[PDB]
Chains A and B, each alone.
Chain A
Amino acid sequence: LDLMSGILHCEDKDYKTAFSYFFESFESYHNLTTHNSYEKACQVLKYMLLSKIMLNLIDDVKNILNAKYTKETYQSRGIDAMKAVAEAYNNRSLLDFNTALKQYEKELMGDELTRSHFNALYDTLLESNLCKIIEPFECVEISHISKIIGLDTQQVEGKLSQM
């Protein structure tokens, strides 16, 4: 019941409530006799970490991640994916996010909730990369921006005008 409420409050685009729900289900699974629940302790963890990414408060992703739990008892394909993507946002880099999903592509497909929130992630990160590049400069050529971000000249003009 908790995990399901987690999936729903995440879609309503509130991520405070989203974390709290995904905590309760993690604690339940962790301590229960695994007969099939190892799998669902795994599902919960990936979604818990999700809350911190969108919240843009990724200092807590690497805080939760530790030897006690994520390394010893949960080392999976999703941990390798989630950690790269967290790290990419901390960088405020578009280039790292793209690389992370090309090689972790089957993990992103496999979770329908993660996939949805990753188009959004694209978009809020698109911002993050541009801002960083033009922050020291004044009177910067648009050609210079265009190469780095790695998106066409005209596409960029429209985004910037919006921003």
Chain B
Amino acid sequence: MSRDAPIKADKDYSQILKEEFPKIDSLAQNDCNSALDQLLVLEKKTRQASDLASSKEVLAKIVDLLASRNKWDDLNEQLTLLSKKHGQLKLSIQYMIQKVMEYLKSSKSLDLNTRISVIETIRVVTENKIFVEVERARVTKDLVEIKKEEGKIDEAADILCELQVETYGSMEMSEKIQFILEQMELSILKGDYSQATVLSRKILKKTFKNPKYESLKLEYYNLLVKISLHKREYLEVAQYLQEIYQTDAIKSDEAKWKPVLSHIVYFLVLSPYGNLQNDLIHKIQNDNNLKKLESQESLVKLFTTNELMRWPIVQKTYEPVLNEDDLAFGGEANKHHWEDLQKRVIEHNLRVISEYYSRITLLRLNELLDLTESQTETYISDLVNQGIIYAKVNRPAKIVNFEKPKNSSQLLNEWSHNVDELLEHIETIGHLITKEEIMH
């Protein structure tokens, strides 16, 4: 409020209490409660100005209460009581409540006391959506930090995550992101990747465009890669790394853009081959930055050219090179992702063979693929289901025909085209004979 009766008169009276500040201090020792009463008695006003000056005294006392690793119990009831009475307004206290919090971080008190006093603050403010909301969150992440380290991580994870669904208040946009990224983090360790997806679609790519959140964007994208790796979505890992790449800062600096680009190659080759794969792999072929690299240049350029190549050797070839690097390939866990590269090689070979070979014997196709009869046939089946190729197989070991099923329509429509093209040619020839008369 703005009540004019306790401006100066009361200010002057608190200064008179400042002079009595040693008398209160000496009282505390004889009885903590008498020193306390006096300062509680001073505060009843609802004049904001004098509220902050009086509460400042009460706050100095709480320094002593918190310092003492036993008095601090009393502090729990008092904050609770100050809430309980009426308060003095929705503006007033709620600044002071923060100086309550400020002190806790720096005391470096016994874990036990800290914990109790902290659960009592979130208790006091729980429901409330005035200023306090922001602060509730500031302290809740701290209660989490303690339980995080313990074996109580599961309990920690569920509380943290629960809170932030609703906190969307006065809070600056930067801080919202921060909390959210933290939430994703505990959910990696818990191992429900499905949970983490729900959380992630909260933050928006519109936000990140603002340069204020630059550093935030890198951690955010870094995390998104992780989510996708667990569920073996290889293309989806590629799309997210490509967004980082385009962050200008990293881009221009040599040493920092280097690893990023390497990663992208690995995952782009592992993606299910398809229309997305294709348009994306000629962007990497075009990429100038790629040709300065030579270890990765030599890998992409192989798979783009249609000249087939047998697995046993390509394995060998890039093993002492790329298995060295991390993500996708790398150590021991990483080898159970490396494996997939095999599969990639043969569905590229088959793919080339459908185009060039219209007819091929089945025994020969096995020889080329370097696989026994039973695996070869499994794989052909898998490709037609996926629609990559058209196939007709014969098991008594006759022929496998990739040729287009030759329909009525195809013969006629192609013939239709041809004829217009002819007519078009004759005309063109005609313009140019005119030209040659002038020349000659």
Residues of A within 8 A of B (CB): 67, 135-141, 144
Contacts and interface: CB of A to CB of B under 8 A. Distances in A.
A67 B398 CA distance: 52
B194 interface: yes
B163 to A, nearest CB: 19
Q: How large is the interface on B (under 10, 10 to 19, 20 to 34, 35 or more residues)?
A: 10 to 19
B394 A136 contact: no
B396 A67 contact: no
B300 interface: no
Contacts of A137: 392-395
A139 B398 CA distance: 9
A136 B395 contact: no
Given A67-B192, A67-B194, A139 B395 contact: yes
A141 B384 contact: no
A95 to B, nearest CB: 14
A141 B393 contact: no
A137 B396 CA distance: 11
Nearest to B192: A67
Given A67-B192, A67-B194, A138 B394 contact: yes
B405 to A, nearest CB: 11
B380 interface: yes
Interface string B3-31: 00000000000000000000000000000
B391 interface: yes
B366 interface: no
Contacts of B195: 67
27 contacts: A67-B192, A67-B194, A67-B195, A135-B381, A135-B384, A136-B380, A136-B381, A136-B384, A136-B391, A136-B392, A136-B393, A137-B392, A137-B393, A137-B394, A137-B395, A138-B392, A138-B393, A138-B394, A139-B394, A139-B396, A139-B398, A140-B393, A140-B394, A140-B395, A141-B395, A141-B396, A144-B395
A140 B392 CA distance: 10
Interface in B94-114: none
A118 B395 CA distance: 33
Contacts of A138: 392-394
Interface string B369-384: 0000000000011001
A76 to B, nearest CB: 20
Contacts of A139: 394-396, 398
B379 to A, nearest CB: 11
A89 B82 CA distance: 64
A8 B211 CA distance: 64
A38 B394 CA distance: 56
A153 to B, nearest CB: 15
Nearest to B383: A136
Contacts of A140: 393-395
Nearest to A133: B381
Contacts of B392: 136-138
